[PDB]
Amino acid sequence: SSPKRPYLLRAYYDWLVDNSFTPYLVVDATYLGVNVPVECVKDGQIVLNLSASATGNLQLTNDFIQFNARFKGVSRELYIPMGAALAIYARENGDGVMFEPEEIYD
């Protein structure tokens, strides 16, 4: 059976947004296939604001997260394999989920 991570990621994303929170995603910068601006990497991780206002054309698919975002004014397209998504939480209070490891992502 396929991984549950993408389904849980979408559930929390919607819950966060619906409850007036700003969804932030924590990404494993070292995971294979991660495609984000280098200046975003800090301590081997990346933190991104996934709200509708901070992003454009956001897609939360089963295998990856993809969207446009602006960095110091520069529009860039990001691609994040689902296996690299470590957690999603509210910027306002840190409420969210830390995804459980899943064999397939290894």
Partner: peptide, 8 residues
């Protein structure tokens, strides 16, 4: 977060 608060 790494990205600007406003995309548009």
């Amino acid at each position: 977060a790494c990205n600007d608060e406003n995309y548009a």
